[PDB]
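agent: user wants the full assembly modeled, not chains individually. Plan: 1) parse entity lines 2) check alphabet per entity 3) run joint structure prediction 4) return tokens. Steps 1-2 passed, four entities, 862 residues total. Proceeding.
--- entities ---
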Amino acid sequence: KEKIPPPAFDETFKKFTFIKMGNKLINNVWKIPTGLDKIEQEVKKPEGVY
Amino acid sequence: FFIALLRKSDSWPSSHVANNSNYSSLNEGGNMIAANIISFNLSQYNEEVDKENYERYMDMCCILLKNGFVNFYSIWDNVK
Amino acid sequence: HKPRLIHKYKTHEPFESLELNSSYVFYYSEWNSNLTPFASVNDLFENSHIYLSIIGPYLGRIPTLLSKISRIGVADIQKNHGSESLHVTIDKWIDYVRKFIFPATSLLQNNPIATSEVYELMKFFPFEKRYFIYNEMMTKLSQDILPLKVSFNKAEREAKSILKALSIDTIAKESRRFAKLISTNPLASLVPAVKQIENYDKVSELVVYTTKYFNDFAYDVLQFVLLLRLTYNRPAVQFDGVNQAMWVQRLSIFIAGLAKNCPNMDISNIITYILKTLHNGNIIAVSILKELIITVGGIRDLNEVNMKQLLMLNSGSPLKQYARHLIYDFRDDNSVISSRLTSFFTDQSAISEIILLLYTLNLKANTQNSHYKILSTRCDEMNTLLWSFIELIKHCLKG
Amino acid sequence: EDKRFIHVSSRSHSRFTSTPITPNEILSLKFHVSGSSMAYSRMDGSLTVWFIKDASFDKSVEVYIPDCCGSDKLATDLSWNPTSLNQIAVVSNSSEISLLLINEKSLTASKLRTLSLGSKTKVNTCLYDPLGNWLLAATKSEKIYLFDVKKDHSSVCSLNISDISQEDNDVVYSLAWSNGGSHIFIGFKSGYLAILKAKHGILEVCTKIKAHTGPITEIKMDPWGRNFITGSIDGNCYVWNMKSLCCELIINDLNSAVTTLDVCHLGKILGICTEDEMVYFYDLNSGNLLHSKSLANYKTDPVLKFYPDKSWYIMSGKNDTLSNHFVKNEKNL
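--- prediction returned ---
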């Protein structure tokens, strides 16, 4: 003797997070910059230190 | 033939023939005398001639819930 | 020339059969008149929240239905190839594989072929959002839904039952039995199997003989598992500093053993791990790079060499090819495999970056104060690494 | 059901006190759809066609001939013609596609023709249509050809292998005609399954799927046209249906590599012969791994072949080389 309402099926998928990789250990590796210009600063002059 | 014979009978629900394809019409149904006979016949499974005829009786009952002959929660609530 | 004679019988069992002379069709021929098939994609994304949320991780018992949904997804991107509708058509199936296609794959027992069909739709994804699905399966493993938690523990006790019966005579019948298991469930049968690589050798030579029978799904998680162990929180240097560790030299003969034997394994994310961490200064990236040159290429150092062979190595001749045959420096043999390795360095334009990084770190090690006999060997070892990489460049980039 | 021994000269070779090697090897075995002939081929021995009329095997010995395809080369496979009962298309190794006739009244074998299309490096595969209206001679090296039989043996078209797949120099291990005669199923070296359309004289590929990661050894077909079964060098032997082109069963009995696949004419028992001298039998309509028998074969390489008319069991695998024929095996213990 009850009135059963129609069930509401969920249509929403889940969101992602800010970590574009899986772990926080893998993702900390892929955040440090690469390129030829960062090496150029420490090799500024060998004679200038000499 | 079993449905065409039983659609013209005086045991077919004429005014309360409500169907099992809605989500609010699984309670409101028809013919609660045949909801007493099948719920009594599916709740017995303790013999050795009753076991060789339970599959064919369950198929015949499953056609009757489709055409709206009986309710769903009248048979679902009253089986073992 | 006569055709065949069949008969049509009616039974109460729903699935169609075919006997020696007769067929068995379901008796209730109007069983489907309540149901209606649907249009292209905008109802399949609507009739799946109803039906496929009931049997959530249970499509592994229906393995044919898992192929037919993924064969739609590859033929939907290829049909919508064009130039325009590829950003939203790819992000549409990035939430349909995460939600109820990839968790249905883990409840599969021994099924290599139906697992590659799911990955064929996963080749169209970024590799960054494939490692998010691969990492979600190992934290939603235990803390969440039950029937795959029983199945992730059924493979970890089946992976460990092969690494105990792993021998050099029964490897003909045990490697096909091992690769079939990592073709089906490699999120479970690989973290045990790598844990006994950085502990015990002489199974590292038995694991890389199995890797000729993997499929292309297994080669992507294996690169994810190797990156999972290289970055785990452990002491990389030992208590004193005189030795590194015993796992860092045992993992580097596994990585350098994949790049030589199996040619179907893309190792470009391992090499991208080498590039970035060298800017920080890291002893694992040096030790992976060092064993790659001596194993894939055949470059040997000239510091034990005879004086008669030393003059023979400067005369440009077939005698130069004879002087490397005596010093065991195989370059004419694995010339194909050495060119494939530098192909991963020249794709990211890394060749001019490695030479400047090994030289800078060697010169930066002239100010660190750790010991007195250590940095007389550490400076010498990094000096013959930079000499060994230059000599690989001139043999591959020829012309 | 009783063990009865096969009466060729191979049983006389081993019955004598001959030490080193009594027969030598078996190259190919094909049946005509009539189900009374045989093409029992050897390496340096004899290709012996057989015609036994009524008895089990002890009626008559028909013909053994070493010098049939010449005296320098060997024959890879012997294709029977479905249209002509007296025609067998033998393809020699180097450069000979000859066509032989057999005589029942005389102890000889005559040759009708020897046609050849030039720059033929090595044709190793020849097989007719199931209705007998085409001949696809395919090399494992360069390209695949297409001829006819109903008018004569005249060329129509050819396709180069490098247009099918694009990875590397791939070898074609085995290919199989469709059951209607309208499609080509071909099996590569890196585990590719490509489907070619061969209606009358046009040869074009439809699609290619990745079956597994090994040399696809054999491809067979179901006599009811529902499915087709492949083999491997892995332990996998899948069963692919045709209406949806997906997988139905998986025979995961990975104890060795797979070498020989056969089905029955009713389509019930799948016979798999592995490399550890172990044979199996299975079921197609029933579940995955439901054996009916397993049999340990001796030290040498066996072959397995099923009759096209009634279920009679041909195995080989005696001490060096002899065939065994198991009569009335509807139960098989």
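agent: reporting back. Chain A touches chain C at residues 9-11, 13-14, 16, 19-23, 25-26, 28-30, 32-36, 38-39, 42-43 (CB under 8 Å). The first helix of chain A runs from residue 24 to 29.
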